[PDB]
Write a protein that binds this ligand. Structure first.
Ligand SMILES: *[C@@H]1O[C@H](CO)[C@@H](O[C@@H]2O[C@H](CO)[C@@H](O)[C@H](O)[C@H]2NC(C)=O)[C@H](O)[C@H]1NC(C)=O
Ligand SMILES: *[C@@H]1O[C@H](CO)[C@@H](O[C@H]2O[C@H](CO)[C@@H](O)[C@H](O)[C@H]2NC(C)=O)[C@H](O)[C@H]1NC(C)=O
Ligand SMILES: O=S(=O)([O-])O[C@@H]([C@H](O)[C@H](O)[C@@H](O)CO)[C@H](O)C[S@+]1C[C@@H](O)[C@H](O)[C@H]1CO
Ligand SMILES: *[C@@H]1O[C@H](CO)[C@@H](O)[C@H](O)[C@H]1NC(C)=O
Length: 863
């Protein structure tokens, strides 16, 4: 064995020859740091027994265990391999215990496959007999994509493992973690996955969510593939420089999907086609959100709101954290400190703003006939709590209010309970959206108020390297019991089940509306239901840098509406950091400035009504709002086709290997390049300029750089923003709310390519109705520019905005002077627009034009 290819046989303890011999592995204490001294042999594992059997969907094989002594339990004797050729670009295989049913994720979106093997496969599947291995290769070039032959298949009740070689080291994904870099180096690295309330810091631990998806860019041609494991048990993913990746899990079954694409974007699209495409956000959820833990009183909250309104900050949503509650209890508000709450909400609404309230899962069990607590009384009547292992007594833990029980959101009768709680509360405080937190689930005691019994669930043969080394640390007992099964098996599905139930509640509370759900904990497929934030970060320059890979990864995971707490949750934010963070933060898909308890104010206006930070924050938030029709159309493509929103350079520029590890810059869709200053004291950033025409957003000027590293001059008041030649960006005059800004004149920014051509599109609907796309109530138009000509073209036309909207300005970058501008409407001429032209910058701006939204036009000019 070449040392890069050794598969570690002692993941659980420091390596010894005696343990190696006892396990029947190979011993070689010679090797570079991290190279396993003890590793699985060439042979041993499982072998194929007899022949493969053709089925309608693909094939089955029986695998029989090559005997050895138990490591972490003894391998299941007979394993069944079921292989389904589901589509041309998606292969599914699962490994089950041939004799017993095992836990399988009861995913809400994924359906069982029936039907026949797809035609025109882009992949071929190869099975080796002795020992068992599975290989998936790309048909067109025979590139080996998945190849398990590097390691054994291990399949014991509480220890399952399968490895695969990888065709390159361009590997992106896995979660939820702070990876720090976007491209995984492929040096010996183990990532534990198990939903846990812990700080997203530099220690590389398991965080709030469970995401097994990874994408691999195979080569410069763009050809890419992805892998997904459908398994909700505690697990870790081991990366090594072969290159190779091992999945090591402690229950369930190995249920794998392999996705192929011509480009990275097509791999994400194939993945989201399987697990579920993201929900379309309400248009208002794309504006700026402001928040903090512990305003303390409504007076203090109103004070913050009003100083940011007075500053003309674009500011659509105010969040209210646990301080609104009466003693941190769900579905109450503090009648003294938040006296006047309903009247404040009216004020918010009348100002065009929205209210999002935090709701925790854990319910106070403190209720007597003297002093009733309704959510607990109604919950106990319905019998909808998570129970201890006896299957009958509700588990007691502790969160914000004191001792608590936990809803079992897997029980469909729990959504009924939860919905009524929301109905009852909305009658008091008319919130518009819901922020669901602490849903790993997070417990202030370990397991329960009486701890956890010693047994194989709470104390398993092998524990992945999760924070603190016990599964029940700061969560529920592993033998706690829910409708979908035991906590051991479904722990990673709590936040997922809770987002599903919460989306159910929205159907009653916000009939026909999307509303907004923000969730902490996630499983694969959570973006169908919710936005995500990156959790309790810290006001450091490290946390600023680390945010970008975290945002890009959740876009691969199909949770495109994602961002961190701008300026940092924990700690007092320095002015310089917060100013650089607000500049970048104006371009996160989810843009929220949120702050921890006790720390100095960090809302933009708090820095002073004439401060650089406020001026800069207002400036870039106004740019964000200007480009909201472009951002919104990007979320439309994510929702309907599965595209990313916040996009890596390498997804558009994969032919250039200089982009393969860029994580300090990113794109909005194909066309907008964002380059933040991310270092203290810097007024410059070393940045990559991909192989395209680029125009400075602010001046419109063509940059002299192409396909090269540059130092971009970015003073205290700037972030780099460039528009790609070849693309047309729809815009709308901004205002301090989207309620108002949506009524304003539209514009087009045409960035010309070398041939003086460009293309773009605009999606437009009512901005809030649920499933306008599935029910086809929307406008979609295309803009295309050739020499001397712009065409506005309508493809779907089943929504006409009642506000009489129109394009009143067109800015053309990289153009020679356009003259004699003519506008035709469905063929008919007329009259004559104004053109202003800057021959130095090659910018033309056409005004005094009125192109109605949803109407076809041709706009023509001479040179
Ligand atoms: C948790 O325990 C409760 C009892 O405390 C179980 O409630 C049962 O619910 C069904 C209706 O769905 C009733 O017909 C039973 O009579 C209830 N039992 C009792 C003793 O009242 C609940 O099923 C348990 N949940 C889980 C996941 O085990
Ligand atoms: C941007 O938003 C505000 C709403 O907050 C609009 O404010 C004014 O609009 C009208 C003036 O033409 C008045 O009828 C409203 O009373 C007034 N609202 C306020 C602040 O009192 C403003 O018009 C919007 N901008 C644009 C271009 O429409
Ligand atoms: O006391 S804290 O440090 O703030 O508790 C955090 C962890 O529980 C804790 O750090 C844990 O990891 C240590 O064991 C918790 O996540 C805060 S929540 C999430 C945030 O967005 C809201 O504003 C907060 C109030 O609702
Ligand atoms: C690792 O964890 C501890 C917090 O318990 C902390 O002291 C340290 O900052 C963390 N390491 C890094 C480098 O983030």
């Amino acid at each position: 064995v070449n040392e890069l290819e050794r598969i570690n046989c002692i993941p659980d303890q420091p390596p010894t020859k005696a343990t190696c011999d006892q396990r029947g592995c190979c011993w070689n204490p010679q090797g570079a740091v991290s190279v396993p001294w003890c590793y699985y042999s060439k042979n041993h594992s499982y072998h194929v027994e007899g022949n493969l059997v053709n089925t309608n969907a693909g094939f089955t094989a029986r695998l029989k265990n090559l005997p050895s002594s138990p490591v972490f339990g003894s391998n299941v004797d007979n394993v069944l391999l079921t292989a389904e050729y589901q589509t041309s670009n998606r292969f599914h295989f699962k490994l089950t215990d041939q004799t017993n049913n095992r836990f399988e994720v009861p995913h809400e979106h994924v359906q069982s496959f029936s039907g026949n093997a797809a035609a025109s496969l882009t992949y071929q599947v190869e099975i080796s007999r002795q020992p068992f291995s599975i290989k998936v290769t790309r048909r067109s070039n025979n590139r080996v994509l998945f190849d398990s032959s590097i390691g054994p298949l291990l399949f014991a009740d509480q220890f399952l493992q399968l490895s695969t070689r990888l065709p390159s080291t361009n590997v992106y994904g896995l979660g939820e973690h702070v990876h720090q870099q976007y491209r995984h180096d492929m040096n010996w690295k183990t990532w534990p996955i198990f939903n846990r309330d812990t700080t997203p810091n530099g220690n590389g631990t398991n965080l709030y969510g469970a995401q097994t998806f990874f994408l691999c860019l195979e080569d410069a041609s763009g050809l890419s593939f992805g892998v997904f494991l459908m398994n909700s048990n505690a697990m870790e993913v081991v990366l090594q420089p072969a290159p190779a990746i091992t999945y090591r899990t402690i229950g369930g079954i190995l249920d794998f999907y392999v996705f192929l694409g011509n480009t990275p974007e097509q791999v994400v699209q194939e993945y989201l086609e399987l697990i579920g495409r993201p929900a379309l956000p309400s248009y208002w959820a794309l504006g700026f959100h402001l928040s903090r833990y512990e305003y303390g009183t409504l007076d203090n909250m109103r004070e913050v709101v009003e100083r940011n309104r007075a500053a003309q900050l674009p500011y659509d949503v105010q969040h209210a954290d646990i301080d609104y509650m009466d003693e941190r209890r769900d579905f109450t508000y503090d009648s003294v400190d938040f006296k006047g709450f309903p009247e404040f909400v009216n004020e918010l609404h009348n100002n065009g703003q929205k209210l999002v309230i935090i709701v925790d899962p854990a319910i106070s069990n403190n209720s007597s006939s003297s002093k009733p607590y309704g959510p607990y009384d109604r919950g106990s009547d319905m019998k909808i709590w998570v129970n201890s292992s006896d299957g009958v007594t509700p588990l007691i833990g502790e969160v914000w209010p004191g001792q608590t029980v936990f809803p079992d959101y897997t029980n469909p009768n729990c959504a009924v309970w939860w919905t009524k709680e929301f109905e009852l509360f909305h009658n008091q405080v008319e919130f518009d959206g819901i922020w669901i937190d602490m849903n790993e689930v997070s417990n202030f005691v370990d397991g329960s108020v009486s701890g956890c019994s010693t047994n194989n669930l709470n104390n398993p043969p092998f524990t992945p390297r999760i924070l603190d080394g016990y599964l029940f640390c700061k969560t529920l007992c592993m033998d706690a019991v829910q409708h979908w099964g035991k906590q051991y098996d479904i722990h990673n599905l709590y936040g997922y089940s809770m987002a599903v139930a919460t989306a159910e509640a929205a159907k009653t509370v916000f009939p026909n509306k999307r509303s907004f759900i923000l969730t902490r904990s996630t499983f694969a497929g959570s973006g169908k239901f919710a936005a995500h934030w990156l959790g309790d970060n810290t006001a450091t320059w490290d946390d600023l840098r680390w945010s970008i890979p975290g945002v890009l990864e959740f876009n691969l995971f199909g949770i495109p509406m994602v961002g961190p707490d701008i300026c940092g949750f924990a700690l007092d934010t320095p002015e310089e950091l917060c100013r650089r963070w607000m500049q970048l933060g104006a371009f996160y898909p989810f843009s929220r400035n949120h702050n921890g308890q006790g720390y100095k104010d960090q809302d933009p206006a708090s820095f002073g009504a004439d401060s650089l930070l406020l001026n800069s924050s207002r400036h870039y938030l106004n740019i964000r709002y200007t480009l909201l029709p472009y951002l919104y159309t990007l979320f439309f493509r994510a929702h309907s086709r599965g595209d990313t929103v916040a996009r890596p350079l390498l997804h558009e520029f994969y032919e250039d290997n200089s982009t393969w590890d860029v994580h300090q810059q990113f794109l909005w869709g194909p066309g907008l390049l964002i380059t933040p200053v991310l270092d203290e004291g810097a007024e410059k950033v070393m940045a990559y300029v991909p192989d395209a025409v680029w125009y400075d957003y602010e001046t419109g000027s063509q940059v002299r750089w192409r396909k090269q590293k540059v130092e971009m001059e970015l003073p205290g008041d700037k972030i780099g923003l460039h528009l790609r030649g070849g693309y047309i960006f729809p815009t709308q005059q901004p205002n301090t709310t989207t309620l108002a800004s949506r009524k304003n004149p539209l514009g087009l920014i045409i960035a010309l390519d070398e041939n003086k051509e460009a293309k773009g599109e605009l999606f437009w609907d009512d901005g809030e109705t649920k499933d306008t796309v599935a029910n086809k109530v929307y406008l979609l138009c295309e803009f295309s520019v050739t020499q001397n000509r712009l065409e506005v073209n309508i493809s779907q036309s089943t929504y006409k905005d009642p506000n009489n909207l129109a394009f009143n300005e067109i800015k053309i970058l990289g153009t020679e002077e356009p003259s004699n501008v003519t506008v035709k409407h469905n063929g008919v001429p007329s009259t004559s627009p104004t053109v202003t032209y800057d021959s130095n910058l090659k910018v033309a701006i056409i005004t005094d034009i009125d192109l109605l939204l949803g109407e076809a036009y041709t706009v023509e000019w001479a040179h």
